[PDB]
């Protein structure tokens, strides 16, 4: 009757794990993603193709995470080691023109440091934040001395995120989900094939997500298992909320030589009465975009229940606060002023912030970095484009549930942008019956 | 597709045959397998030949080939059979048919046929 | 364009096989990862070409062979397969028999080569 | 020897295609550079082989096709091209049309495959 | 299984050539050594395929040529070679003529192409 006919170049594919490369249009990101991008990149709409996506099992996220960790470790690789600074410090509190809000925050320290010649020392005076210095038994030591060495980040190396496009190698394709309400899981009917993702700006933050993409129709709430209290909730806003952050005093940067060819930077002196770092959000805007979230939450929990917001539960500074890099400085802001409301069926909110220079980045033990001080007054303006929330355990109780800012993995920040992309492998051979036979 | 045969059935032993078939439902210019077959008491069915409506080329039964041609006029969706050295032996019922034979499909379309006496 | 035929029926999709073929051959740690990716692309390409070689389909995008179709692999009208189904759907339907069919294709070519040793012009 | 025919006419040089074909295949930092170079030579080789396969040419150094020559690509005689010109000159003469010609070669083979889907002889 | 025919006579061993073909394809220092090995395996594979191309045997496991067998390479009965010898023994007997034979196969194919260019459809 029928015989097997072999076809090569058959348009089929299967789910696959591969290595993607990046491309982009003294910046680390630009240096690494050296491959250029196309102007006017094209995509091919696949008519009548239904595909299944799962953002929680997406391995593009895992690769992006791993490659980012690598960039940081490579970028700091050739920079000045600060091992010689792990010495006993003699410190007093700065009490000079300090407002109450900042009392006890700065420590004025001195120590006997080396010079480029091994037989000579110099007395060095500098200012430190209390979060970087711990008392020995006054005598103090840098906080990292009992765990690991610390490396000074190079002041000429910029980590400012730029859009990064992830691109598939030949033999692979990236499928993009365009369904407007897609929540990351299940079938998608408007799909297209692309070579590279849209640009993703790799902003690293904790509780609030900054400078990401916005939802187009409504606030979209995505989760792996919505009734599972062990899972987080990623909320994508359809409107941005502007947040204005500052470090109001005029800091002066000084430097000393530690060894041949190696310079160390420190804050010499702060000019003006000392005031705390802080971030502002419009109060009305924050309230409106919170109400929008609540409406979407009611869709899953009931429109007769009470939705309450509350602050973080406790833990390390890096978890309990909103962490971000502003101008190159590292801020840890208190969000308890935002997550404080109960929802039952002009002015700004000011969030006080703290700053620290010794940073254990990416939830690792050791491999610390020292963030050089920044000269002058720091100001930045960012867009809040989404939130990471968790539900506070609970039971039926009185059907009031509380959503708290979550801690979260850094992976969650990439999962929120890569949710619409899938990587598949192309498999060109196939067979089917026809009426032909080998001719002879 | 629908096929309708035509042409005179009264042929003198000294003249040619000219039979024109109408095609309806598709175009001659887009297909192949347009053919002529004849039926006579001495031979149940004898293939004559076919024409490629896309290229205009033909193929003929070698025994008839020396005196026969097939051609088309796609502007009216018609095609025809012409035989020059027509004799008494050529008395037969002639049919117009469409033969579709490809890797993925097989079918025939036949018209009702006409009778020619020589 | 590439994969634009993904939602097309098998018959229609088979009209554009070249587009799917011509798109297959396009810091120490980063450098090693990229070399590994390039090597796999080559190894996979060559593996598929070798099978076409073994089955006697070298150099063709569409190849007819002598292995009969088994009604147990799939039992559908020829018209059902070519007109009302896409290649993605088909691949899922018969993914269970992929290895059986490949094994048979190899056996058939081996028999053909044995027949060519005949010199009585194979009849 | 290799490239010995570079200054010869196209006709004469077409007889040395084989010698040219045979010469295409023959400290961490240094090791990566060398792997880079070897992989690329393989990739380029395979791309040329794939194009020939797409165009319907496989295992041939000289292959004929059905694409007509356009006087707009080059308006010259056969005696002129084959006897009084070298391949280097020719390559420069028509470098403007390389992609046009390649596109046509692919289209011609695709039509040929469509014609082969008929069991009817198409005469 | 692979190489199971190694002790078989040449005739019998030739019955299973596909099995011998399908087995040809599959910390910084460790990674480089492995890439070294994989690239090299590909290069060897392609080298042999190129020769089959050059000799006019592309896509075949068994290929007839136009080069006469020389009694100076090996003077044995046809039945002696095929029934009473293994391929390993044969390879040793003619290892000195490997390059001579390959050179002749190349010349033969070049002449065949020259004859094809004639158009009188006569050798
Ligand atoms: C969310 O997205 C916003 C918008 O993209 C980001 O805000 C930008 O942040 C960068 C980095 O901090 C700012 O870049 C700096 O610009 C300074 C010049 O400012 C003037 O000129 C620009 C011209 O475009 C005006 O827009 C601006 O209003 C001012 O009039 C430069 O002087 C800075 O240079 C520093 O680095 C170089 C490195 O080579 C050193 O040599 C310099 O001495 C100095 O240290 C720097 O380039 C950018 O201006 C900000 N944009 C806006 C509109 O304010 C947010 O940072 C981002 N959020 C998060 C969390 O990442
Ligand atoms: C922060 O949000 C504002 C809007 O509130 C963005 O600015 C607009 O961007 C669109 C892009 O299509 C432009 O068409 C508008 O004209 C812009 N508005 C204004 C007032 O300029 C802004 O780009 C967002 N910032 C970031 C970093 O994403
Ligand atoms: C955050 O908002 C506060 C007000 O709540 C701003 O502080 C005021 O700034 C004006 C000048 O524009 C002064 O006249 C007021 O006296 C200040 N108020 C207080 C209580 O000190 C603050 O500058 C805003 N910060 C940011 C980053 O926008
Ligand atoms: C963040 O800073 C911007 C300025 O960089 C503020 O925007 C201005 O606000 C005034 C009213 O106080 C308007 O008259 C200006 O036209 C606005 N300028 C621009 C460019 O928009 C913004 O309000 C501040 N945001 C917050 C939350 O404090
Ligand atoms: C410095 O601040 C700490 C805060 O715990 C306080 O106990 C200590 O007495 C202060 N020292 C001086 C000199 O004010
Ligand atoms: C620095 O060295 C001198 C001795 O030369 C010693 O008296 C002084 O206490 C040391 N100071 C510090 C901060 O270590
Ligand atoms: C380092 O000192 C701090 C402050 O006393 C302490 O909390 C931390 O556990 C110590 N680290 C190690 C590795 O002992
Ligand atoms: C797919 O896109 C079309 C516009 O081209 C739109 O009308 C249709 O609603 C979209 N489908 C889905 C599921 O969003
Ligand atoms: C939303 O998530 C649920 C699982 O909680 C899933 O079944 C559904 O397909 C997802 N997508 C949409 C558009 O609802
Ligand atoms: C966000 O969604 C709400 C849904 O109620 C809508 O009213 C609002 O206009 C939307 N905002 C934008 C910028 O689309
Ligand atoms: C969602 O979470 C609940 C816990 O409340 C669990 O019982 C259920 O199995 C989870 N759903 C899935 C699909 O795993
Ligand atoms: C509230 O929940 C009910 C289900 O009990 C649903 O039918 C209704 O659409 C929801 N929303 C509103 C505004 O009532
Ligand atoms: C949350 O707010 C309470 C006051 O209502 C405060 O005592 C607690 O320390 C805050 N949590 C964190 C992590 O700061
Ligand atoms: C946040 O602000 C509240 C104000 O009541 C304060 O009690 C709490 O300790 C602050 N938490 C952090 C982490 O700064
Ligand atoms: C939460 O709101 C109440 C007023 O309802 C206020 O008294 C309390 O201080 C607020 N909490 C924070 C952390 O600002
Ligand atoms: C948000 O603003 C509205 C007025 O538009 C007010 O009624 C509501 O109570 C405010 N939100 C909260 C949580 O208090
Ligand atoms: C999708 O189905 C329609 C049915 O009328 C068909 O016309 C269209 O060509 C199909 N899309 C593709 C890519 O084949
Ligand atoms: C293939 O056909 C044979 C009969 O020739 C039958 O016994 C066998 O079960 C069929 N299917 C498979 C998978 O072998
Ligand atoms: C055979 O097909 C069934 C139905 O599609 C599937 O559930 C099963 O896993 C398949 N078995 C194999 C070996 O593919
Ligand atoms: C160079 O030109 C002369 C012209 O007399 C010709 O005889 C010779 O063969 C040419 N050289 C080559 C390499 O073809
Ligand atoms: C190729 O030939 C066509 C006529 O068949 C002519 O229109 C065209 O201009 C020629 N050349 C190019 C480069 O298109
Ligand atoms: C086309 O030919 C002209 C010379 O006539 C040349 O200047 C131009 O660069 C060529 N274009 C291409 C793509 O080779
Ligand atoms: C080994 O030699 C014997 C001789 O009688 C033969 O029958 C047997 O098949 C040979 N083994 C192999 C693998 O050919
Ligand atoms: C091949 O045969 C010829 C005689 O026809 C002889 O002269 C030549 O030496 C032989 N080849 C070898 C390698 O001996
Ligand atoms: C030629 O073959 C013989 C075996 O017949 C071998 O001993 C000799 O070494 C070979 N010649 C060379 C140069 O290797």
PDB file of N, CA and C and ligand atoms in Angstrom, chain E residues 70 72-73 97 100, ligand 24:
ATOM      1  N   UNK E  70      46.502  -3.979 -10.283  1.00  0.00           N
ATOM      2  CA  UNK E  70      47.877  -4.303 -10.651  1.00  0.00           C
ATOM      3  C   UNK E  70      48.331  -5.581  -9.942  1.00  0.00           C
ATOM      4  N   UNK E  72      51.252  -6.269  -9.464  1.00  0.00           N
ATOM      5  CA  UNK E  72      52.393  -5.892  -8.669  1.00  0.00           C
ATOM      6  C   UNK E  72      51.982  -5.408  -7.295  1.00  0.00           C
ATOM      7  N   UNK E  73      50.693  -5.147  -7.083  1.00  0.00           N
ATOM      8  CA  UNK E  73      50.250  -4.698  -5.777  1.00  0.00           C
ATOM      9  C   UNK E  73      50.008  -5.934  -4.966  1.00  0.00           C
ATOM     10  N   UNK E  97      51.062   0.148  -1.057  1.00  0.00           N
ATOM     11  CA  UNK E  97      50.435   0.627  -2.267  1.00  0.00           C
ATOM     12  C   UNK E  97      49.240   1.477  -1.950  1.00  0.00           C
ATOM     13  N   UNK E 100      49.489   4.759  -3.747  1.00  0.00           N
ATOM     14  CA  UNK E 100      49.518   4.615  -5.179  1.00  0.00           C
ATOM     15  C   UNK E 100      48.116   4.415  -5.674  1.00  0.00           C
TER      16      UNK E 100
HETATM   17  C1  LIG F  24      51.399  -1.390 -12.632  1.00  0.00           C
HETATM   18  O1  LIG F  24      51.462  -2.162 -13.876  1.00  0.00           O
HETATM   19  C2  LIG F  24      52.479  -1.648 -14.834  1.00  0.00           C
HETATM   20  C3  LIG F  24      52.364  -2.513 -16.087  1.00  0.00           C
HETATM   21  O2  LIG F  24      51.106  -2.329 -16.730  1.00  0.00           O
HETATM   22  C4  LIG F  24      53.908  -1.694 -14.177  1.00  0.00           C
HETATM   23  O3  LIG F  24      54.863  -1.114 -15.069  1.00  0.00           O
HETATM   24  C5  LIG F  24      53.896  -0.873 -12.841  1.00  0.00           C
HETATM   25  O4  LIG F  24      55.204  -0.944 -12.248  1.00  0.00           O
HETATM   26  C6  LIG F  24      52.806  -1.471 -11.868  1.00  0.00           C
HETATM   27  N1  LIG F  24      52.681  -0.718 -10.584  1.00  0.00           N
HETATM   28  C7  LIG F  24      53.507  -0.890  -9.528  1.00  0.00           C
HETATM   29  C8  LIG F  24      53.304  -0.104  -8.258  1.00  0.00           C
HETATM   30  O5  LIG F  24      54.447  -1.699  -9.562  1.00  0.00           O
END
